[PDB]
Design a protein around this nucleic acid. Sequence first.
RNA 1: GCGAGAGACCGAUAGCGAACAAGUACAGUGAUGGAAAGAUGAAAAGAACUUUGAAAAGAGAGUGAAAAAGUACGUGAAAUUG
RNA 2: AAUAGGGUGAAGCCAGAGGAAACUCUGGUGGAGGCUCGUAGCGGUUCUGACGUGCAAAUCGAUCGUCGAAUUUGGGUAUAGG
RNA 3: UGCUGUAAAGCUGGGUCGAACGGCCUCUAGUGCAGAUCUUGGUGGUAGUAGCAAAUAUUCAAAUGAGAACUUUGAAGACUGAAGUGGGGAAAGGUUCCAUGUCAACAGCAGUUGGACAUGGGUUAGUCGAUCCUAAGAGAUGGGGAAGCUCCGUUUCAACGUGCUUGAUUUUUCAGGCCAACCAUCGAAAGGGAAUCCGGUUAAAAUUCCGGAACUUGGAUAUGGAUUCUUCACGGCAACGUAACUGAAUGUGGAGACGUCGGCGUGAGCCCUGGGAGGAGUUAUCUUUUCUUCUUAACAGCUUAUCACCCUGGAAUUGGUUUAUCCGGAGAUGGGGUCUUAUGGCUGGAAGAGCGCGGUAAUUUUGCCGCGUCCGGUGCGCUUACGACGGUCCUUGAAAAUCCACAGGAAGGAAUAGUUUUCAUGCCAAGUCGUACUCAUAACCGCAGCAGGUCUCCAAGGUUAACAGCCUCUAGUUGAUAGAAUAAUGUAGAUAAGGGAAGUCGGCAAAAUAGAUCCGUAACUUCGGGAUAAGGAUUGGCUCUAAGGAUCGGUUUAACGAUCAACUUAGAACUGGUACGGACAAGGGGAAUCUGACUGUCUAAUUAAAACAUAGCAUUG
RNA 4: UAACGAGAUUCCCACUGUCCCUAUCUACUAUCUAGCGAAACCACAGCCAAGGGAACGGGCUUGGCAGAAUCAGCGGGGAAAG
RNA 5: AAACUUUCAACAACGGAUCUCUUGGUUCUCGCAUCGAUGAAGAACGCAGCGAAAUGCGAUACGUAAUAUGAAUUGCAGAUAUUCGUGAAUCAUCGAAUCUUUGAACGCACAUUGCGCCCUCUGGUAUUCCGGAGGGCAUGCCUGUUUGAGCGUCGUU
Lengths: 50, 249, 112, 86
Amino acid sequence: PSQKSFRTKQKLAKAQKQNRPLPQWIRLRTDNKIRYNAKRRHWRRTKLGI
Amino acid sequence: GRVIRNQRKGAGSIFTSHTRLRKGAAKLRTLDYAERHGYIRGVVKQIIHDPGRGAPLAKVAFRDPYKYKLREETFIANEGVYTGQFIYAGKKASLNVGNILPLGACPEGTIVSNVEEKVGDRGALGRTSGNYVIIIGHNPDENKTRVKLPSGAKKIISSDARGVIGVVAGGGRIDKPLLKAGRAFHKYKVKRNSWPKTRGVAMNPVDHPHGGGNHQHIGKASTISRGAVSGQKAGLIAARRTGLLRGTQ
Amino acid sequence: AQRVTYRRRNPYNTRSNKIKVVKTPGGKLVAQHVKKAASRVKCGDCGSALAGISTLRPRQYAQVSKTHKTVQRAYGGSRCANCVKERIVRAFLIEEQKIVKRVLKEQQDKEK
Amino acid sequence: GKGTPSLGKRHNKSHTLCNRCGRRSFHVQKKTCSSCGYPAAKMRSHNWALKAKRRRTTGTGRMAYLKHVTRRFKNGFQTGVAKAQT
RNA sequence: GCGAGAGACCGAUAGCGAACAAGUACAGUGAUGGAAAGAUGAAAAGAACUUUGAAAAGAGAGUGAAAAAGUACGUGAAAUUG
RNA sequence: AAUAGGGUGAAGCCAGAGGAAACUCUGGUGGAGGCUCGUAGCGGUUCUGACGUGCAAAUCGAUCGUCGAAUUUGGGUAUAGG
RNA sequence: UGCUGUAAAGCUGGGUCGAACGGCCUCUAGUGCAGAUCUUGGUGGUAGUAGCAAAUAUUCAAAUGAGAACUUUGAAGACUGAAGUGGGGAAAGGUUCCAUGUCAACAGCAGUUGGACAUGGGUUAGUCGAUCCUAAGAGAUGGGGAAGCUCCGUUUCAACGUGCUUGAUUUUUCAGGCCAACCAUCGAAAGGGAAUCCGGUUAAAAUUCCGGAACUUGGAUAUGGAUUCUUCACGGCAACGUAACUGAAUGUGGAGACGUCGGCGUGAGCCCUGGGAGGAGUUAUCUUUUCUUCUUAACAGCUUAUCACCCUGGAAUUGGUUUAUCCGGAGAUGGGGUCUUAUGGCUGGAAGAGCGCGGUAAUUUUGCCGCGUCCGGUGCGCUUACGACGGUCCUUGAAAAUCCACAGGAAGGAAUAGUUUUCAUGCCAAGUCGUACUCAUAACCGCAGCAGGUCUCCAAGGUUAACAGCCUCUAGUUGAUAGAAUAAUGUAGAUAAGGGAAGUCGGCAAAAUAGAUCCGUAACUUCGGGAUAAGGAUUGGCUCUAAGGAUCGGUUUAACGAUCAACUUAGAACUGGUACGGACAAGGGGAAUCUGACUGUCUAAUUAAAACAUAGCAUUG
RNA sequence: UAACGAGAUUCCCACUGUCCCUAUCUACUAUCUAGCGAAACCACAGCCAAGGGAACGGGCUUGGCAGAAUCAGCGGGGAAAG
RNA sequence: AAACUUUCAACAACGGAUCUCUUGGUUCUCGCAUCGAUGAAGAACGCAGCGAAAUGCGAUACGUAAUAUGAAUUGCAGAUAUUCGUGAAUCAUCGAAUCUUUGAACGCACAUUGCGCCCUCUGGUAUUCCGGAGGGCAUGCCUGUUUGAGCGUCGUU
Ligand SMILES: [Mg+2]
Ligand SMILES: [Mg+2]
Ligand SMILES: [Mg+2]
Ligand SMILES: [Mg+2]
Ligand SMILES: [Mg+2]
Ligand SMILES: [Mg+2]
Ligand SMILES: [Mg+2]
Ligand SMILES: [Mg+2]
Ligand SMILES: [Mg+2]
Ligand SMILES: [Mg+2]
Ligand SMILES: [Mg+2]
Ligand SMILES: [Mg+2]
Ligand SMILES: [Mg+2]
Ligand SMILES: [Mg+2]
Ligand SMILES: [Mg+2]
Ligand SMILES: [Mg+2]
Ligand SMILES: [Mg+2]
Ligand SMILES: [Mg+2]
Ligand SMILES: [Mg+2]
Ligand SMILES: [Mg+2]
Ligand SMILES: [Mg+2]
Ligand SMILES: [Mg+2]
Ligand SMILES: [Mg+2]
Ligand SMILES: [Mg+2]
Ligand SMILES: [Mg+2]
Ligand SMILES: [Mg+2]
Ligand SMILES: [Mg+2]
Ligand SMILES: [Mg+2]
Ligand SMILES: [Mg+2]
Ligand SMILES: [Mg+2]
Ligand SMILES: [Mg+2]
Ligand SMILES: [Mg+2]
Ligand SMILES: [Mg+2]
Ligand SMILES: [Mg+2]
Ligand SMILES: [Mg+2]
Ligand SMILES: [Mg+2]
Ligand SMILES: [Mg+2]
Ligand SMILES: [Mg+2]
Ligand SMILES: [Mg+2]
Ligand SMILES: [Mg+2]
Ligand SMILES: [Mg+2]
Ligand SMILES: [Mg+2]
Ligand SMILES: [Mg+2]
Ligand SMILES: [Mg+2]
Ligand SMILES: [Mg+2]
Ligand SMILES: [Mg+2]
Ligand SMILES: [Mg+2]
Ligand SMILES: [Mg+2]
Ligand SMILES: [Mg+2]
Ligand SMILES: [Mg+2]
Ligand SMILES: [Mg+2]
Ligand SMILES: [Mg+2]
Ligand SMILES: [Mg+2]
Ligand SMILES: [Mg+2]
Ligand SMILES: [Mg+2]
Ligand SMILES: [Mg+2]
Ligand SMILES: [Mg+2]
Ligand SMILES: [Mg+2]
Ligand SMILES: [Mg+2]
Ligand SMILES: [Mg+2]
Ligand SMILES: [Mg+2]
Ligand SMILES: [Mg+2]
Ligand SMILES: [Mg+2]
Ligand SMILES: [Mg+2]
Ligand SMILES: [Mg+2]
Ligand SMILES: [Mg+2]
Ligand SMILES: [Mg+2]
Ligand SMILES: [Mg+2]
Ligand SMILES: [Mg+2]
Ligand SMILES: [Mg+2]
Ligand SMILES: [Mg+2]
Ligand SMILES: [Mg+2]
Ligand SMILES: [Mg+2]
Ligand SMILES: [Mg+2]
Ligand SMILES: [Mg+2]
Ligand SMILES: [Mg+2]
Ligand SMILES: [Mg+2]
Ligand SMILES: [Mg+2]
Ligand SMILES: [Mg+2]
Ligand SMILES: [Mg+2]
Ligand SMILES: [Mg+2]
Ligand SMILES: [Mg+2]
Ligand SMILES: [Mg+2]
Ligand SMILES: [Mg+2]
Ligand SMILES: [Mg+2]
Ligand SMILES: [Mg+2]
Ligand SMILES: [Mg+2]
Ligand SMILES: [Mg+2]
Ligand SMILES: [Mg+2]
Ligand SMILES: [Mg+2]
Ligand SMILES: [Mg+2]
Ligand SMILES: [Mg+2]
Ligand SMILES: [Mg+2]
Ligand SMILES: [Mg+2]
Ligand SMILES: [Mg+2]
Ligand SMILES: [Mg+2]
Ligand SMILES: [Mg+2]
Ligand SMILES: [Mg+2]
Ligand SMILES: [Mg+2]
Ligand SMILES: [Mg+2]
Ligand SMILES: [Mg+2]
Ligand SMILES: [Mg+2]
Ligand SMILES: [Mg+2]
Ligand SMILES: [Mg+2]
Ligand SMILES: [Mg+2]
Ligand SMILES: [Mg+2]
Ligand SMILES: [Mg+2]
Ligand SMILES: [Mg+2]
Ligand SMILES: [Mg+2]
Ligand SMILES: [Mg+2]
Ligand SMILES: [Mg+2]
Ligand SMILES: [Mg+2]
Ligand SMILES: [Mg+2]
Ligand SMILES: [Mg+2]
Ligand SMILES: [Mg+2]
Ligand SMILES: [Mg+2]
Ligand SMILES: [Mg+2]
Ligand SMILES: [Mg+2]
Ligand SMILES: [Mg+2]
Ligand SMILES: [Mg+2]
Ligand SMILES: [Mg+2]
Ligand SMILES: [Mg+2]
Ligand SMILES: [Mg+2]
Ligand SMILES: [Mg+2]
Ligand SMILES: [Mg+2]
Ligand SMILES: [Mg+2]
Ligand SMILES: [Mg+2]
Ligand SMILES: [Mg+2]
Ligand SMILES: [Mg+2]
Ligand SMILES: [Mg+2]
Ligand SMILES: [Mg+2]
Ligand SMILES: [Mg+2]
Ligand SMILES: [Mg+2]
Ligand SMILES: [Mg+2]
Ligand SMILES: [Mg+2]
Ligand SMILES: [Mg+2]
Ligand SMILES: [Mg+2]
Ligand SMILES: [Mg+2]
Ligand SMILES: [Mg+2]
Ligand SMILES: [Mg+2]
Ligand SMILES: [Mg+2]
Ligand SMILES: [Mg+2]
Ligand SMILES: [Mg+2]
Ligand SMILES: [Mg+2]
Ligand SMILES: [Mg+2]
Ligand SMILES: [Mg+2]
Ligand SMILES: [Mg+2]
Ligand SMILES: [Mg+2]
Ligand SMILES: [Mg+2]
Ligand SMILES: [Mg+2]
Ligand SMILES: [Mg+2]
Ligand SMILES: [Mg+2]
Ligand SMILES: [Mg+2]
Ligand SMILES: [Mg+2]
Ligand SMILES: [Mg+2]
Ligand SMILES: [Mg+2]
Ligand SMILES: [Mg+2]
Ligand SMILES: [Mg+2]
Ligand SMILES: [Mg+2]
Ligand SMILES: [Mg+2]
Ligand SMILES: [Mg+2]
Ligand SMILES: [Mg+2]
Ligand SMILES: [Mg+2]
Ligand SMILES: [Mg+2]
Ligand SMILES: [Mg+2]
Ligand SMILES: [Mg+2]
Ligand SMILES: [Mg+2]
Ligand SMILES: [Mg+2]
Ligand SMILES: [Mg+2]
Ligand SMILES: [Mg+2]
Ligand SMILES: [Mg+2]
Ligand SMILES: [Mg+2]
Ligand SMILES: [Mg+2]
Ligand SMILES: [Mg+2]
Ligand SMILES: [Mg+2]
Ligand SMILES: [Mg+2]
Ligand SMILES: [Mg+2]
Ligand SMILES: [Mg+2]
Ligand SMILES: [Mg+2]
Ligand SMILES: [Mg+2]
Ligand SMILES: [Mg+2]
Ligand SMILES: [Mg+2]
Ligand SMILES: [Mg+2]
Ligand SMILES: [Mg+2]
Ligand SMILES: [Mg+2]
Ligand SMILES: [Mg+2]
Ligand SMILES: [Mg+2]
Ligand SMILES: [Mg+2]
Ligand SMILES: [Mg+2]
Ligand SMILES: [Mg+2]
Ligand SMILES: [Mg+2]
Ligand SMILES: [Mg+2]
Ligand SMILES: [Mg+2]
Ligand SMILES: [Mg+2]
Ligand SMILES: [Mg+2]
Ligand SMILES: [Mg+2]
Ligand SMILES: [Mg+2]
Ligand SMILES: [Mg+2]
Ligand SMILES: [Zn+2]
Ligand SMILES: [Zn+2]
């Protein structure tokens, strides 16, 4: 809702930051195995936990 | 089987009394020096309806004998008591309607209400609308008085116990039919969760000793021993007799 | 006709969420939230509304002068005129009778 | 109508985030955590749920202090500073 | 728990649930439940350039010992299919 | 916190008529009731209609019960597996 | 490619491949698969099949683009029809909001579009909510149980103030003066509650920003005024008035603050409408026409009211009076006054704003100039707020925080000066968290962009009893794969000669009736009902007729004149393919038996009933 | 037992496609196309008659017969599926 | 005869069996004794020149100090970085520090980044109001200190 607590709003800020695509320069590191961010989250598809 | 409706009431989850709207506990004054030795005078400020009670309550203001303050008491209103009336309470109070007197100061045949069972408990007997206590006689050597209670029982009480002169107001309430389930719903809406009652014979054997059968019937005597246990005491408990009451008792 | 919306997060027609309909200088029609109507100061003896005293919501009495909250008499903002008149007469007559009940209980302490 | 129509009336959270474990197991009306038992002094744990102990035990977090007890013990819990060799 | 050394043990559907960003993703209001998932090549040398196509791509070409190794990656069975 | 529009017309009240009296009658007024037709609402009678790998793990259509109270309902709160 | 062996199997030619492996004597075992509705993984036929059919509906053109039924724009045709497909919110979601780019995956067709993907941007508060209060309740403490996790208890068998108030003291010590019924705490974004409005502004925020104009609380504090030599003001018979105009402990009240309905009155907003000043549309003909602008916030001053109250006075020939029945020697009618300021008016705020026109500046940030923005009427109208009343209950319809007044009279107070911040003005500050967006036939939950579910606010015109149904204004959509045909059988909807329940377990389904006015209305009955019983007539359009008021004006023929004004009812003539509640809307009726008295309740998802409940009755403790 | 009842039952008036006995019309399907594209089920499969047989065969025995590839319907059988 | 269906072979698909590996697991043995109010285990939120995760860390935030060693780090960038040296990198080592909001969690409270009070300093003309900086205020129990209470009780007037 529009009326939300600080504890809730701080968790929603982290959820946005965890939803980024992989930075592309990370695939250039030697012996790198990460091809993409495997922890993407869509708002409609998978719900958080607040 | 299952816990029957009798036993669930003791836990008091949904079976506590609905007391939001109540106007205070109806009690006599605390027995103090003034009532023990003389009399104290108060004035009736209000006569109000108490939800869940057939009897109206009276709010009576007295002065504090020891500090500068007014004390408001909640008495059960006797019929004929009016707002602005002077109420006298103590050993030396006069025999007027609304006054609070010890039982020994009242002659035989005195009609009294809100009588103390024990000295200083501030009223136990005859508190509902239309009911009263008749003073039967005195035993001055043992300081005891015989009275007749609204149930017709005779009791021996200390002559120092106090009571309020008159009959509790609001009598004759039972003379009128309720006429409706809704009227009983509103009656018990401010008393407690005890209405309506499902008949045990119409439930299943898990729910009640009377449940089950291809016809509705109790199957065994509904008079239950006094020494029976909880979950069994459903019906006529310790019934001395059954059937239509014919003649005097 | 133009229709309006609440101005606060409360969406319910409660007693403290009452609105009036006001036309603005912009020719629009907006809701203006109203505070609950004040009740009249009443006599502590008879319960009637006291004359000469402003009808305000209780906190607003702190920020108004004393002449609005009282009447120039004994028990000014507390009791009505008739209840003060009855207090004065009752005090005088009863205390006068107190002397009468005293002197009689001294005439009988020398003859009885 | 006990299925899909009744499932539409789920908008009152029974649990919210716990301050001790942050799990959304804090019963709002009970004021208790169903996971760690907060605000009880002891941690909720059962021997009939050994997998639950795996999920929350020593080593599942940072061990920000027990990390170094082995390394401090191995040196006999030195007090002072290391001396540079000449 | 800490620190080591081992085995007629298992060899990615096995061996701990987890050889991998595994108690992870995800489910459930909740207690709890709980995976799948290793392998190009010695070395990215991970295919410049030209050309058709709107593009993905394709055809020439190039690297490489091998492209009958192109991150749909060693080997590449069967079911099933052109 | 919420509940269109109608019907019926309870006490109380006004006026007139008849009568010796006890009383009765008439015209208004009034607006009662877990009254009534009927929306919203709440429910769910029948087609044993549709659908019955559905729009849907209970829905859709028409028809229907009730609809000012034992009414409907939000949120908070209480009761926990013999 | 063959060879060997009865066989389990072994060996070998060719192809592929790339790092280990085998023969023999023995040891050892998690050692041999076709099944176990086996397990896990992978793949078929079915099969380009079932199907993608609810929510009225799309079409032409241009632009863009490689590509357009589906994107954008324009034109049209439509729908939702204020109980919305509109405009906001609570819960829940969490960036879905906005801009730019964008089509591999997703939007069960498509896609240049998107709630998708990528990159950035975006949520501004003393006044809006939290925070504070307490509700049901939750729950520490002293304690009491229990082996114990813990249970009980909430002022309880308790020595329960981290007390205050002053005069101070500058001696950072004190001197004391009062009190300690009740008093941990949490518990409401719908209860209670200090205070903000208008105009403008962004791509996206606004009661938050800008401009202007206010307000509350806490604190500080000076000037003016007020008051005193009769020290703590005056006036009024009184209700009471005021710019002010001492007041400790303690006490008493009020506000906070209270159910549900009925009619009536007033206001506000909306609806309707006349004149005038503008703009747009129709104009073959008609229409002094149809549509549209003419608005005014919080706040300040003055004024303004039903109720209530005061002074006067003494009433039967009783009077006053409401739609509704009450009041008066416990003092009516009459005359004269006092109060609350809800509400309206005037003025300031404030025309400078906004709005409607006309003339211009210019790629142009953005304007600049001129004119107008005025005066009314109407009402069983709608909605809503308030008010004075009336009804109702074996139902009488929260608490606390907080604010004020009064009683009381402690204490301190003047004359050459004293007091007070409840009169006016002036100074400082108001922290923390939320604030974007959806609120649903696509932002929540139902596995999903699901015909389901999910709390609430506003509400135009016509017809009408109606917020019903139908049509329309504002607003919003035109979304649901599309194209072509129109066999059978379907699903939904219509009609039918004559017969009229012969069908069928059964009139299931459908039909018939239906609004309104007038007439008429049975048995039985608990006298309340039954009842819309049953059964008939009428109903359109037009032109008339009659009836039903408001406000004023003077010896009571005002029994008359003047002005203004609403839709109701009744009757008549004429009229027409005998039609007319013309769509919409809308009872089938009657005679009986069984059964439960009735209203009400339950088997969410096969049973709504005669089952349960109920009032009443009786019994028990 | 008045009143009430989506309660069970019988008859009468009105009414009608329930019926004699069926016919016609509309929209959406079904149908064909572009695109998209599942599922149940599956020992092997799929023409009959008799015989015998686990006493009711698609298969066995003896006969009838038998000619590619197919489309819309249908509900006898697969002692169909669930 | 085509087509279709079926069988077989080659190649191409689908799929990931087989073979071979293995910083993992599993089991046995040997050795050791070290959590926490000096705030543990765990949770939440943050931290990099360019980072989402894992790992590490805490506003000194993929780290500061020290010791050792001795020239890197590396995907790119970049020193006002370094090389015969107090000197690159390094969870190599580690003895000094930092260590957010919390958590037995300790001023009270917490679905709130809610609400107090004390001490010192400081700003706003301030012991009192508002702001800021630093340091404090939990409970049970033990020893001790101080201040008290009770005709429980002892001496004396
Ligand atoms: Mg928000
Ligand atoms: Mg969802
Ligand atoms: Mg979760
Ligand atoms: Mg048993
Ligand atoms: Mg008692
Ligand atoms: Mg009950
Ligand atoms: Mg019963
Ligand atoms: Mg009973
Ligand atoms: Mg039963
Ligand atoms: Mg028995
Ligand atoms: Mg039993
Ligand atoms: Mg029985
Ligand atoms: Mg029976
Ligand atoms: Mg029986
Ligand atoms: Mg029997
Ligand atoms: Mg808003
Ligand atoms: Mg009041
Ligand atoms: Mg009083
Ligand atoms: Mg009173
Ligand atoms: Mg006054
Ligand atoms: Mg006043
Ligand atoms: Mg579910
Ligand atoms: Mg609910
Ligand atoms: Mg709950
Ligand atoms: Mg949860
Ligand atoms: Mg930690
Ligand atoms: Mg080790
Ligand atoms: Mg080890
Ligand atoms: Mg070793
Ligand atoms: Mg595995
Ligand atoms: Mg490999
Ligand atoms: Mg591989
Ligand atoms: Mg390699
Ligand atoms: Mg190598
Ligand atoms: Mg290439
Ligand atoms: Mg290429
Ligand atoms: Mg090539
Ligand atoms: Mg080469
Ligand atoms: Mg090779
Ligand atoms: Mg190969
Ligand atoms: Mg290869
Ligand atoms: Mg492959
Ligand atoms: Mg290879
Ligand atoms: Mg390969
Ligand atoms: Mg194959
Ligand atoms: Mg309506
Ligand atoms: Mg009605
Ligand atoms: Mg009826
Ligand atoms: Mg409605
Ligand atoms: Mg409905
Ligand atoms: Mg039908
Ligand atoms: Mg059916
Ligand atoms: Mg079907
Ligand atoms: Mg129909
Ligand atoms: Mg109906
Ligand atoms: Mg209905
Ligand atoms: Mg009804
Ligand atoms: Mg009611
Ligand atoms: Mg059980
Ligand atoms: Mg159990
Ligand atoms: Mg158990
Ligand atoms: Mg039991
Ligand atoms: Mg058992
Ligand atoms: Mg190799
Ligand atoms: Mg085996
Ligand atoms: Mg197998
Ligand atoms: Mg199988
Ligand atoms: Mg399988
Ligand atoms: Mg298949
Ligand atoms: Mg098809
Ligand atoms: Mg379909
Ligand atoms: Mg449609
Ligand atoms: Mg393009
Ligand atoms: Mg379309
Ligand atoms: Mg379309
Ligand atoms: Mg268009
Ligand atoms: Mg329409
Ligand atoms: Mg409507
Ligand atoms: Mg809406
Ligand atoms: Mg919301
Ligand atoms: Mg972003
Ligand atoms: Mg958008
Ligand atoms: Mg875009
Ligand atoms: Mg698509
Ligand atoms: Mg996104
Ligand atoms: Mg604030
Ligand atoms: Mg506020
Ligand atoms: Mg907050
Ligand atoms: Mg605060
Ligand atoms: Mg505050
Ligand atoms: Mg407060
Ligand atoms: Mg309480
Ligand atoms: Mg407790
Ligand atoms: Mg106690
Ligand atoms: Mg000191
Ligand atoms: Mg609180
Ligand atoms: Mg609140
Ligand atoms: Mg509130
Ligand atoms: Mg409120
Ligand atoms: Mg402006
Ligand atoms: Mg401006
Ligand atoms: Mg501006
Ligand atoms: Mg906005
Ligand atoms: Mg102030
Ligand atoms: Mg004056
Ligand atoms: Mg005081
Ligand atoms: Mg009050
Ligand atoms: Mg209240
Ligand atoms: Mg109310
Ligand atoms: Mg009332
Ligand atoms: Mg009213
Ligand atoms: Mg009006
Ligand atoms: Mg003009
Ligand atoms: Mg025209
Ligand atoms: Mg205001
Ligand atoms: Mg006269
Ligand atoms: Mg009336
Ligand atoms: Mg002009
Ligand atoms: Mg001019
Ligand atoms: Mg309204
Ligand atoms: Mg009212
Ligand atoms: Mg009122
Ligand atoms: Mg006073
Ligand atoms: Mg006093
Ligand atoms: Mg005084
Ligand atoms: Mg504050
Ligand atoms: Mg908003
Ligand atoms: Mg909404
Ligand atoms: Mg909305
Ligand atoms: Mg939906
Ligand atoms: Mg929906
Ligand atoms: Mg939407
Ligand atoms: Mg579902
Ligand atoms: Mg779910
Ligand atoms: Mg509601
Ligand atoms: Mg209408
Ligand atoms: Mg409306
Ligand atoms: Mg419609
Ligand atoms: Mg459609
Ligand atoms: Mg079509
Ligand atoms: Mg047809
Ligand atoms: Mg049909
Ligand atoms: Mg037709
Ligand atoms: Mg026809
Ligand atoms: Mg016809
Ligand atoms: Mg016919
Ligand atoms: Mg004919
Ligand atoms: Mg007939
Ligand atoms: Mg007939
Ligand atoms: Mg028949
Ligand atoms: Mg028949
Ligand atoms: Mg028959
Ligand atoms: Mg028959
Ligand atoms: Mg039959
Ligand atoms: Mg029918
Ligand atoms: Mg017909
Ligand atoms: Mg009739
Ligand atoms: Mg009848
Ligand atoms: Mg006519
Ligand atoms: Mg109809
Ligand atoms: Mg019928
Ligand atoms: Mg019944
Ligand atoms: Mg009713
Ligand atoms: Mg019923
Ligand atoms: Mg129920
Ligand atoms: Mg059912
Ligand atoms: Mg049913
Ligand atoms: Mg029913
Ligand atoms: Mg009886
Ligand atoms: Mg008895
Ligand atoms: Mg019936
Ligand atoms: Mg029924
Ligand atoms: Mg019968
Ligand atoms: Mg029979
Ligand atoms: Mg037919
Ligand atoms: Mg049709
Ligand atoms: Mg078909
Ligand atoms: Mg097709
Ligand atoms: Mg098959
Ligand atoms: Mg055969
Ligand atoms: Mg055969
Ligand atoms: Mg067979
Ligand atoms: Mg054979
Ligand atoms: Mg044969
Ligand atoms: Mg044959
Ligand atoms: Mg068949
Ligand atoms: Mg089948
Ligand atoms: Mg079967
Ligand atoms: Mg051939
Ligand atoms: Mg190992
Ligand atoms: Mg935290
Ligand atoms: Mg060195
Ligand atoms: Mg630091
Ligand atoms: Mg830390
Ligand atoms: Mg917090
Ligand atoms: Mg905190
Ligand atoms: Mg708090
Ligand atoms: Mg301690
Ligand atoms: Zn009074
Ligand atoms: Zn927890």
